[PDB]
Amino acid sequence: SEKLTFKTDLEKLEREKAAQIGVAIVDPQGEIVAGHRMAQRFAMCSTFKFPLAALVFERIDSGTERGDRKLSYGPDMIVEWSPATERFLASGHMTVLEAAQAAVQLSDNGATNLLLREIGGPAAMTQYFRKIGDSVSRLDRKEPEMNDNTPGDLRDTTTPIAMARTVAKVLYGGALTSTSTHTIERWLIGNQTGDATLRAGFPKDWVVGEKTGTCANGGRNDIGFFKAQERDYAVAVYTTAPKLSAVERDELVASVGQVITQLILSTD
Q1: Is 166 helix (H, G, I), strand (E, B) or coil?
Q2: Which of 32, 74, 132, 179 has the fewest CB atoms in 10 Å of its CB?
Q3: Which cysteine pairs make disulfide bonds?
Q4: CB atoms near residue 10 (< 10 Å)
Q5: What's the rounded Cα separation, in Å, for the pair 236 and 245?
């Protein structure tokens, strides 16, 4: 009902924009609220940096990593779009927390690779997904190649449903201590890269936090959480729109925001 509209409206976007749209919305326990191609595989792009941050916190939680440990690097660690890494380059390090926060709030690629160097690489990222009960999401490469988004390639993908549930796990499911959870949640709320995407599509009174992703070949994604009408939701949106402009891809994810708002409001 609400459901059929949700679906209809996405299918219209898909048609008119020549795009594929993958969406999952779940409650804090991971129960499905609404989805579209929810188990189609989509490249993660930078959306993985959020789970990367959760993995880091889990290791801080358990005493196997320290938030203020200094990670030294040189210019070899700078990749495309590494705004904070470049700033700290001369100082010669960024802490574990500095790097995680820049990865999350700026999508800093060098900071992401610095973290991956410390935690055991893509294999370790993937292991963590498995640890939090996600058996679908997979990191196979580092930045920037993990964003190649080669048509058909299953490397470095997830499904809206698995990622939605993973988000719910970290935010509501007890994967992190109450202190880590709160911190990573504030980080998503204060994300600097999501202004023109999902949150542009949600009402202004919802508490929204999220992490965007951009891949080659028309990938544009946004995952996070929102609290509407005192209910908590985890959401994952992955889109593929090869012939749209970057701006229009932003606008497409925003439009998806709207369709989701309509569903949630109509839902009881």
Answers
A1: helix
A2: 74
A3: 45-215
A4: 24
A5: 21
| Count of the separate structural domains present in the chain | 1
What pairs with residue 234 in β-bridges?
26, 225
Q: Is 1 a catalytic residue?
A: no
Compute the distance between CA of residue 83 and CA of residue 104 in angstroms, rounded to an integer: 12
Q: Binding site residues, as ranges?
A: 49, 107, 143
* Spatial CA neighbour of 89 closest among 105, 106, 71, 115: 71
Q: Decide: residue 20, CB within 10 A, 0-12 exposed, 13-18 middle, 19+ buried.
A: middle
Using only C-alpha atoms, what is the Rg of the chain? 17
Residue owning tokens 């080669």: 150
Please provide the distance, in angstroms rounded to a whole number, between the alpha carbons at the two ends of the chain: 12
Per the listing, tokens 């880590």 go with 180
**Choosing from 1, 46, 82, 255, which is the catalytic residue?**
46
Structure tokens at 12: 């219209």
Q: According to the entry, how was the structure determined?
A: X-ray
CATH number of the CATH domain containing 138: 3.40.710.10
Which range marks the domain in which residue 141 is found? 1-268
Q: Which residues are annotated as a binding site for a beta-lactam?
A: 49, 107, 143
Structure tokens that stand for 185 in this block: 């949640």
Give the amino acid at 264.
I
- Left, alpha or beta for 187 (phi > 0: left; psi -120 to 50: alpha)? alpha
